[PDB]
Design a protein around this ligand. Structure first.
Ligand SMILES: *[C@@H]1O[C@H](CO)[C@@H](O[C@@H]2O[C@H](CO)[C@@H](O)[C@H](O)[C@H]2NC(C)=O)[C@H](O)[C@H]1NC(C)=O
Ligand SMILES: *[C@@H]1O[C@H](CO)[C@@H](O[C@@H]2O[C@H](CO)[C@@H](O)[C@H](O)[C@H]2NC(C)=O)[C@H](O)[C@H]1NC(C)=O
Ligand SMILES: [Cu+2]
Ligand SMILES: [Cu+2]
Ligand SMILES: [Cu+2]
Ligand SMILES: [Cu+2]
Length: 497
């Protein structure tokens, strides 16, 4: 069952074996992935998170972010550790009490402390629309139509050795899949459909790192939502999905009753499908209980290309139709060297005092805010443009902005900008060497909003900045509850800070 919009959520340690290999984990709701948190557009969510963690090898503190939810007036509930809060300590709980006006779509939640989400604290978050403009395109949309794609590691996140390459050991689809090495025939996930019906499949990348080439043998996929934003229908036969992105697609159960492979090929780790790695099963009701015998094509006919997506609504693009045609046009220098990432020459290292608390205590320019050089002010009620030219090692980097979605004025692998009708989304691949992926948004949400690469290993290695949006109005806009004010004193006492 789905939980929410008002629910407790306990964070625990447990052993799991999603690929047949047992290791300890950090879990929400006792499962990997965590349970789906759900409600309707405009609802009040009150997620009371109970930190019951005891194993220090995966950190006993925690903090949870609600990815893609704008948190307008509730910046204190956003979750990134040392940006909007101090972590919750073990044996304590905290009510993330917020509303979701004006949003409906497919989201997710995850730890936002260190690399802890990799250790298991990740799950879907769905905001349904009772009046969805896409409702007539499908028959079924429920917990059985959510498809999560996850990387899974045998080595614990905190225990990944400094200086060795990090790759995953299994792809997990709906929490199950097989290991790339020492492969055993552990159970695969089954997604069940009925011949003749149409399904809103909600595809969620909960990845810590790889992008996936997602397909379903014999089928095609009609995209209707991108990172929470309704799209015009776009039919594809493969989706390259980067860390933290979401798509809804209509699956028409229009093939013969049978079994079909579901494929999710990561860009690192095991290549191919030998032994059933990188695989799940689409099973029609009435099919034999057996593995598919289908194959992929050598070449996909209609892969997703980001510039083909367009909003369902008339969203346009703010600003003027040329580079730099914004009130605050920025170009970030994104670099990597010697194990650390940097933005405009500064590698992100989380501060002792969360950025929001520094602002509430009266620090009112961004040059005043710690970490020095990592916090950039944005003016209120202004069009912002951010060019994110690629080239830094470890790409392609999926950049994500908290508090906002954005127009993707320029996409990967295509030098032509689109000032007319590009898709809006919240996580975008910045592409390859020489690219100039560029985003635009308007500043109508006071507070400090993290901008970072969503490859968690890269965030940990410093690939982030904070946009302190409308510093002057942050305090008035974001009244804080006592429990939030209590977090940093409790954390600092527990840690002798
Ligand atoms: C990406 O686009 C930005 C603009 O959105 C380019 O920024 C210009 O950079 C040159 C130096 O390279 C400056 O003289 C300009 O002031 C910048 N802004 C403009 C023209 O609006 C940037 O060069 C582009 N980067 C790449 C790699 O293509
Ligand atoms: C590269 O990106 C551009 C801009 O998004 C794409 O150009 C659009 O193409 C559509 C479809 O033919 C036209 O309706 C638009 O008028 C174009 N807009 C602009 C600003 O040129 C282009 O299709 C993309 N290239 C590829 C190969 O997909
Ligand atoms: Cu996220
Ligand atoms: Cu986010
Ligand atoms: Cu990255
Ligand atoms: Cu983040």
């Amino acid at each position: 069952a789905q939980i929410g919009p008002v629910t407790d959520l306990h964070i625990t340690n447990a052993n799991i074996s999603p690929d047949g290999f047992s290791r300890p984990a950090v879990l929400a709701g006792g499962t990997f992935p965590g349970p789906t948190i759900a409600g309707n557009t405009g609802d009040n969510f009150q997620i009371t998170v109970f930190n019951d963690l005891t194993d220090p090898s995966m950190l006993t503190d925690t903090s949870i972010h609600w990815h893609g939810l704008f948190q307008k007036g509730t910046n204190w509930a956003d979750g990134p550790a040392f940006v909007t809060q101090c972590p919750i300590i073990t044996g304590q709980s905290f009510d993330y009490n917020f509303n979701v006006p004006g949003q409906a779509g497919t989201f997710w939640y995850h730890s936002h402390l260190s690399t802890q989400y990799c250790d298991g604290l990740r799950g879907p978050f769905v905001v349904y629309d009772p009046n969805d403009p896409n409702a007539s395109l499908y028959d079924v949309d429920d917990d059985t139509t959510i498809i999560t794609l996850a990387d899974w590691y045998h080595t614990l996140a905190q225990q990944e050795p400094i200086g060795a390459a990090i790759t995953a050991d299994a792809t997990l689809i709906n929490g199950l899949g097989r290991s790339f090495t020492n492969t055993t025939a552990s159970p695969l996930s089954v997604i069940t459909v009925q011949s003749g019906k149409r399904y809103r499949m909600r595809l969620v990348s909960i990845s810590c790192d790889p992008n996936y080439l997602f397909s379903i043998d014999g089928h095609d996929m009609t995209i209707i939502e991108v990172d929470g934003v309704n799209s015009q229908q776009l039919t594809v036969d493969q989706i390259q999905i980067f860390a933290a992105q979401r798509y809804s697609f209509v699956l028409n159960a229009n093939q013969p009753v049978g079994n079909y492979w579901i494929r999710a090929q990561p860009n690192s780790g095991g290549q191919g499908f030998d032994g059933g790695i990188n695989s799940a099963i689409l099973r029609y009701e009435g099919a034999t209980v057996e593995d598919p015998t289908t194959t992929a094509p050598t070449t996909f006919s209609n892969p997703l290309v980001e510039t083909d997506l367009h909003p369902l609504a008339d969203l346009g693009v703010p600003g003027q139709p040329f580079r730099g045609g914004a009130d605050d046009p920025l170009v970030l220098n994104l670099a990597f060297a010697n194990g650390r990432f940097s933005i405009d020459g500064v590698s992100f290292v989380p501060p002792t005092v969360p950025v929001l608390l520094q602002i509430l205590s009266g620090a009112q320019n961004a040059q005043d805010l710690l970490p020095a050089g990592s916090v950039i002010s944005l003016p209120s009620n202004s069009v912002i443009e951010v060019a994110l030219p690629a080239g830094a090692a470890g790409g392609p980097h999926p950049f994500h902005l908290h508090g906002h979605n954005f127009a993707v004025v320029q996409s990967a692998n295509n030098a032509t900008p689109n000032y007319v009708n590009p898709i809006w989304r919240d996580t975008v691949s910045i592409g390859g060497t020489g690219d100039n992926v560029t985003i635009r948004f308007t500043t109508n949400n006071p507070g400090p909003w993290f901008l970072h690469c969503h490859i968690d290993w890269h965030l940990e290695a410093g690939f982030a900045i904070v946009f302190a949006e409308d510093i002057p109005d942050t305090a008035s806009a974001n009244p804080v509850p006592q429990a939030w004010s209590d977090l940093c004193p409790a954390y600092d006492q527990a840690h002798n800070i």
